[PDB]
PDB file of C-alpha atoms in Angstrom:
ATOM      1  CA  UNK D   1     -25.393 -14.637 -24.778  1.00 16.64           C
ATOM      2  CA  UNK D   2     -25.179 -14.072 -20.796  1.00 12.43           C
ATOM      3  CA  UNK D   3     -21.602 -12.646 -19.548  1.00 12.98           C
ATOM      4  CA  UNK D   4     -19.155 -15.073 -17.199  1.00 13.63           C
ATOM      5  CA  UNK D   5     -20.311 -14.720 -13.660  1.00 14.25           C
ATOM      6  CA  UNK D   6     -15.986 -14.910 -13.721  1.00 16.54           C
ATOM      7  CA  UNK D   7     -16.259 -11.392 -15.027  1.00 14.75           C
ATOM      8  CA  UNK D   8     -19.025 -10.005 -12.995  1.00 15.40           C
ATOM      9  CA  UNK D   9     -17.197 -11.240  -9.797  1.00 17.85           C
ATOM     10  CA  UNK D  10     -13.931  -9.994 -10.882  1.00 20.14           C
ATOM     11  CA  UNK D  11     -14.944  -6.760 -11.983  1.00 21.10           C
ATOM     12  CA  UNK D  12     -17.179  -6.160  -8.491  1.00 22.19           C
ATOM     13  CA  UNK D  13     -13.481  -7.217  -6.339  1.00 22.59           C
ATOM     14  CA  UNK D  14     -12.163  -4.379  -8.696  1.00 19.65           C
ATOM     15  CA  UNK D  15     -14.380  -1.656  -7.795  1.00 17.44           C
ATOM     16  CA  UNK D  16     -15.429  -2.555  -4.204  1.00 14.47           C
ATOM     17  CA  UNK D  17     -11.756  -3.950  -3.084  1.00 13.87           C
ATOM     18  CA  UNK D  18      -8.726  -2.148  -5.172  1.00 15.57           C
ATOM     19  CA  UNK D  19      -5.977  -2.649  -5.276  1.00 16.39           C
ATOM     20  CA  UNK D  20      -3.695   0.024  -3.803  1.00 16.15           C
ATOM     21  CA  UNK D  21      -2.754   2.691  -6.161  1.00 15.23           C
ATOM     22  CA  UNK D  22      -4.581   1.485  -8.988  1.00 13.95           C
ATOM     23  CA  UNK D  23      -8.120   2.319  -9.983  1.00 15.93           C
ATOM     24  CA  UNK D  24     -10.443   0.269 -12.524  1.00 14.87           C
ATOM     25  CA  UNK D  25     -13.576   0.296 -13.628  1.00 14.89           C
ATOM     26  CA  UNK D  26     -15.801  -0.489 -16.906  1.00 15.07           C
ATOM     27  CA  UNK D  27     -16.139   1.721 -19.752  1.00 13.55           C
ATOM     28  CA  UNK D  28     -21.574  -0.700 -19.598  1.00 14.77           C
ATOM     29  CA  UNK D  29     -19.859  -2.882 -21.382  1.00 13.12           C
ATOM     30  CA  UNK D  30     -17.391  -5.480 -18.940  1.00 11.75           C
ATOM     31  CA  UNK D  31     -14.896  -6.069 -21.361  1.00 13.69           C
ATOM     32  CA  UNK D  32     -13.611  -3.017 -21.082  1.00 12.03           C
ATOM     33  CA  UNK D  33     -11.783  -1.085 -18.537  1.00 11.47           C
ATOM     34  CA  UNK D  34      -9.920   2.106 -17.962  1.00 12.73           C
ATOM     35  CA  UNK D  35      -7.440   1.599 -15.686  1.00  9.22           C
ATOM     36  CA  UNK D  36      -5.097   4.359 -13.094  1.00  4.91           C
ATOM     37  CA  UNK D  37      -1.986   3.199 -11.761  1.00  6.53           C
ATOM     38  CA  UNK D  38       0.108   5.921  -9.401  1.00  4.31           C
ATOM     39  CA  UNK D  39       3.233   6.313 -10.595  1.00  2.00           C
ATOM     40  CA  UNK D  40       5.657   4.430  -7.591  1.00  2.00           C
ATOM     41  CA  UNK D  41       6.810   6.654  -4.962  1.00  2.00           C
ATOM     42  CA  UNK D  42      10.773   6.798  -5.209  1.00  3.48           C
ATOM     43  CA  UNK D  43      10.645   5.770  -9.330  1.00  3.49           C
ATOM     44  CA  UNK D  44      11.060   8.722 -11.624  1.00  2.00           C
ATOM     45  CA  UNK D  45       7.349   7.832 -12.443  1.00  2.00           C
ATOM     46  CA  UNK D  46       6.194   9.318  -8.965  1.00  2.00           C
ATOM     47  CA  UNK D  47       4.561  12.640  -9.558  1.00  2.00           C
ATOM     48  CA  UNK D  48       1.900  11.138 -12.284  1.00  2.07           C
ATOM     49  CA  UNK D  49      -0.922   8.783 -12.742  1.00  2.41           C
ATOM     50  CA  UNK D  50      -0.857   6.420 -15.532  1.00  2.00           C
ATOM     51  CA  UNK D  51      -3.885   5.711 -17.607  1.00  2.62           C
ATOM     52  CA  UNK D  52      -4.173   2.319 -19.297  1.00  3.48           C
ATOM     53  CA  UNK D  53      -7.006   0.471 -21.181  1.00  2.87           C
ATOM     54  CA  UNK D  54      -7.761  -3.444 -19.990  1.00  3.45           C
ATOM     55  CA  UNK D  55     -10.019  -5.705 -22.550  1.00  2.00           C
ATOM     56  CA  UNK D  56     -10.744  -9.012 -22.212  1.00  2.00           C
ATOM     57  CA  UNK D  57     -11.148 -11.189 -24.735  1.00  2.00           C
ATOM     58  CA  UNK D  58     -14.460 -13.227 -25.880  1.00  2.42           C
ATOM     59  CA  UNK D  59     -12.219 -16.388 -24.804  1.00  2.33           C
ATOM     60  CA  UNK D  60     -10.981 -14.761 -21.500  1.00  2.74           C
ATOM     61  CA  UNK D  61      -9.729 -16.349 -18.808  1.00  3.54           C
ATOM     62  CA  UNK D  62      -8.152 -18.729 -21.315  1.00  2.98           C
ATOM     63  CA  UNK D  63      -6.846 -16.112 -23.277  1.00  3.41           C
ATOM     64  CA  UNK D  64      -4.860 -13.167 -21.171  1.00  5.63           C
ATOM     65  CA  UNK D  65      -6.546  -9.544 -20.861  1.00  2.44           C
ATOM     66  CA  UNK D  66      -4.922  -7.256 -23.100  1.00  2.98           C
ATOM     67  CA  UNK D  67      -3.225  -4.176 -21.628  1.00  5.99           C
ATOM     68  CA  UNK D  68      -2.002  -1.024 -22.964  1.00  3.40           C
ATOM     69  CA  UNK D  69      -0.661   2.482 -21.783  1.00  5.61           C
ATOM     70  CA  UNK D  70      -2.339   5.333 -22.997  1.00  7.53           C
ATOM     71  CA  UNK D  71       0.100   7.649 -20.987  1.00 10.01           C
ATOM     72  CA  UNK D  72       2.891   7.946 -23.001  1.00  8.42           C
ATOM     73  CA  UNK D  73       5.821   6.607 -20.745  1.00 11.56           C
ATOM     74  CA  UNK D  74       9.927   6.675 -21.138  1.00 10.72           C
ATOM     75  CA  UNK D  75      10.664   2.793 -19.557  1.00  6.68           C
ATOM     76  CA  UNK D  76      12.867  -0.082 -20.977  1.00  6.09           C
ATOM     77  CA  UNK D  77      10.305  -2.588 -20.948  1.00  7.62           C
ATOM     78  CA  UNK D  78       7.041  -0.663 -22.294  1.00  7.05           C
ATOM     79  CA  UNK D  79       7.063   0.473 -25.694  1.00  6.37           C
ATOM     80  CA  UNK D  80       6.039   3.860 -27.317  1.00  2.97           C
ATOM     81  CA  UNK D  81       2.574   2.625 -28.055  1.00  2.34           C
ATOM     82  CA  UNK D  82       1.796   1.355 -24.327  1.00  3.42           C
ATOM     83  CA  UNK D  83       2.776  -2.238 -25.402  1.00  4.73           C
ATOM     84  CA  UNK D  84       4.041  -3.629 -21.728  1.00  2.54           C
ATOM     85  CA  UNK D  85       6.605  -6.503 -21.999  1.00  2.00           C
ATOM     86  CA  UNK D  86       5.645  -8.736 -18.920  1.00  2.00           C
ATOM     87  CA  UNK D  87       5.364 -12.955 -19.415  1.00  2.00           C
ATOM     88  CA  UNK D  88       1.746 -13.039 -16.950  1.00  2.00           C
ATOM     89  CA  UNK D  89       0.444 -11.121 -20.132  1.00  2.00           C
ATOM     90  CA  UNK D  90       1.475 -13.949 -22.369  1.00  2.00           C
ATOM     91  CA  UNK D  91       2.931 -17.400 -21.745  1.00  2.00           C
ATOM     92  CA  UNK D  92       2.638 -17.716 -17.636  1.00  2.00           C
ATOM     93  CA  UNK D  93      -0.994 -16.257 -18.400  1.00  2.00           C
ATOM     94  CA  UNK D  94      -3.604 -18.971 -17.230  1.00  2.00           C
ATOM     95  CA  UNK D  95      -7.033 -18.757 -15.622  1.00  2.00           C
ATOM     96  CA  UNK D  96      -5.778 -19.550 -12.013  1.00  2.00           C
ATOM     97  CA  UNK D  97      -4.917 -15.776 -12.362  1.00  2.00           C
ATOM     98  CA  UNK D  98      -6.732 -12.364 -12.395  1.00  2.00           C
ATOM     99  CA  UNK D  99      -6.405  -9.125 -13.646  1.00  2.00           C
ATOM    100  CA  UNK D 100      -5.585  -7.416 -10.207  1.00  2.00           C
ATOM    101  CA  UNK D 101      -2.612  -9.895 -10.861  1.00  2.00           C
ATOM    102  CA  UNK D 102      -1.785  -8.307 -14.143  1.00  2.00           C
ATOM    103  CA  UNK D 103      -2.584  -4.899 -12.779  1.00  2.00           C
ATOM    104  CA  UNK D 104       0.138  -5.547  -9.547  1.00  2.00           C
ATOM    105  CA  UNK D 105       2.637  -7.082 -12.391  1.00  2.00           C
ATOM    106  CA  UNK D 106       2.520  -3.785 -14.113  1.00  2.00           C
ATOM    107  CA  UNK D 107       2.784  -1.650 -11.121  1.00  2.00           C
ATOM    108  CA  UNK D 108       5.445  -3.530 -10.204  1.00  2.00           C
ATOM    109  CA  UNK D 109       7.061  -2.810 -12.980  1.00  2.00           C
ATOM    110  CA  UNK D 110       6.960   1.095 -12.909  1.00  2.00           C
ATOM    111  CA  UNK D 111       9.148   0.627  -9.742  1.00  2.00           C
ATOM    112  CA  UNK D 112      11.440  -2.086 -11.347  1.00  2.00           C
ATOM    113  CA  UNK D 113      12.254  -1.164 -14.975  1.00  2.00           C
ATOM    114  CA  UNK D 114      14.646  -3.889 -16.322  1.00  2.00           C
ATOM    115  CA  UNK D 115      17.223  -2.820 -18.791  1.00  2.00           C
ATOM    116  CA  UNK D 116      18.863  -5.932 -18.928  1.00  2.00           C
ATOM    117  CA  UNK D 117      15.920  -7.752 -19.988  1.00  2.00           C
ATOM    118  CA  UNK D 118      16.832  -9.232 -23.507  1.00  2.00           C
ATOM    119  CA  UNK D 119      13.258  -7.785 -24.842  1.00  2.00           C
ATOM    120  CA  UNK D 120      14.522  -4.104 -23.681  1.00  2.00           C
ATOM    121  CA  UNK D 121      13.325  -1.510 -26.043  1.00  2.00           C
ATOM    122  CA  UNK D 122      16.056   0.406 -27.660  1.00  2.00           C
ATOM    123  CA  UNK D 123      16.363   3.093 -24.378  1.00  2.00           C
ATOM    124  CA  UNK D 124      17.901   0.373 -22.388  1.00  2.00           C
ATOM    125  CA  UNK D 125      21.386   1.002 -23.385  1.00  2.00           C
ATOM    126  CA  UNK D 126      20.828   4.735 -21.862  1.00  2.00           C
ATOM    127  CA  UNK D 127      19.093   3.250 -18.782  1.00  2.00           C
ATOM    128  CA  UNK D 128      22.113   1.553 -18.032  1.00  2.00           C
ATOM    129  CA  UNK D 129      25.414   3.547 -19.267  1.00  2.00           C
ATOM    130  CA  UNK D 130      23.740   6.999 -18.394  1.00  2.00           C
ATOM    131  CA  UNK D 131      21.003   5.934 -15.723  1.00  2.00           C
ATOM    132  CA  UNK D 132      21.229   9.831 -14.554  1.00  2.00           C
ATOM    133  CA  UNK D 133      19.870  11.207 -17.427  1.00  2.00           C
ATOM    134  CA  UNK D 134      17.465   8.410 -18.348  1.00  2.00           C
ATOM    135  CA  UNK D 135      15.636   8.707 -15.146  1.00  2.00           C
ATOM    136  CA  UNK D 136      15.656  12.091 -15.681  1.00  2.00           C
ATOM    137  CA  UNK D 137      13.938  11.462 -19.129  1.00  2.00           C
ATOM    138  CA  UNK D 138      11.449   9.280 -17.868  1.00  2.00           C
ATOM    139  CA  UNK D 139      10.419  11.617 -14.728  1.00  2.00           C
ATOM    140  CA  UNK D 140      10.540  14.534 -17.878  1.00  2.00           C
ATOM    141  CA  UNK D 141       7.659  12.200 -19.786  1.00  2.00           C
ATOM    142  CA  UNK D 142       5.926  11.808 -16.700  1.00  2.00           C
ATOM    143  CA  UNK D 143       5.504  15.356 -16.118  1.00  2.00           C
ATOM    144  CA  UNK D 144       5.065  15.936 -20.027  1.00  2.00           C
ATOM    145  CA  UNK D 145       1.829  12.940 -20.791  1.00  2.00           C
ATOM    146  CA  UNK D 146       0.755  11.539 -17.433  1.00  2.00           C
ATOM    147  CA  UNK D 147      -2.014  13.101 -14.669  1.00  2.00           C
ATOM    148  CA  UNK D 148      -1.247  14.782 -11.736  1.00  2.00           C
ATOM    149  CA  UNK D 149      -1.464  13.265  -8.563  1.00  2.00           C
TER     150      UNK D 149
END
């Protein structure tokens, strides 16, 4: 009946205190978000913003927010439907954390794709053999599906 002051004071620290690089803000309903992250300066993802969508569950904060790319992104860890591989999204996930925690995680890793991961989708092989040209790939897909910065 009457939203989680949780949410309300979340969502207000999201708008009035971001977190660098990253924007987010409701799409009047709070349980959803649209959310920016800058690609890392120095990644391949540099020259492009990311668009992602945020929900949170009717059982959030005891059930993680769920996070997708809409940007269509070349990384070893993030599939080709936005699906981000990151354990604060699902079994280190409590309600001691927030989503500006999720939001960093994912930032974080735009600037630290991990090929070795055993979950590595299947362009991980490339990533590491021919890191050159996957790079090159994944800075082509940036300038192909994300924003401009």
């Amino acid at each position: 009946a009457s939203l989680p002051k949780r949410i309300i004071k979340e969502t207000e620290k999201l708008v009035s205190d971001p977190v660098p690089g990253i924007t987010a803000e409701p799409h009047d309903n709070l349980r959803y978000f649209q959310v920016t992250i800058e690609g890392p300066e120095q990644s391949p993802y540099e020259d492009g913003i990311f668009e992602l969508e945020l929900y949170l569950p009717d059982d959030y904060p005891m059930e993680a927010p769920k996070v997708r790319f809409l940007t269509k992104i070349y990384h070893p860890n993030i599939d080709r439907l936005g699906r981000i591989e990151l354990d604060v999204l699902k079994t280190n996930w409590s309600p001691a954390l927030q989503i500006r925690t999720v939001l960093l995680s994912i930032q974080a890793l735009l600037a630290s794709p991990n090929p070795n991961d055993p979950l590595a989708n299947d362009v991980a092989e490339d990533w590491i053999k021919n890191e050159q040209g996957a790079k090159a790939k994944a800075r082509e897909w940036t300038k192909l599906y994300a924003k401009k910065k």
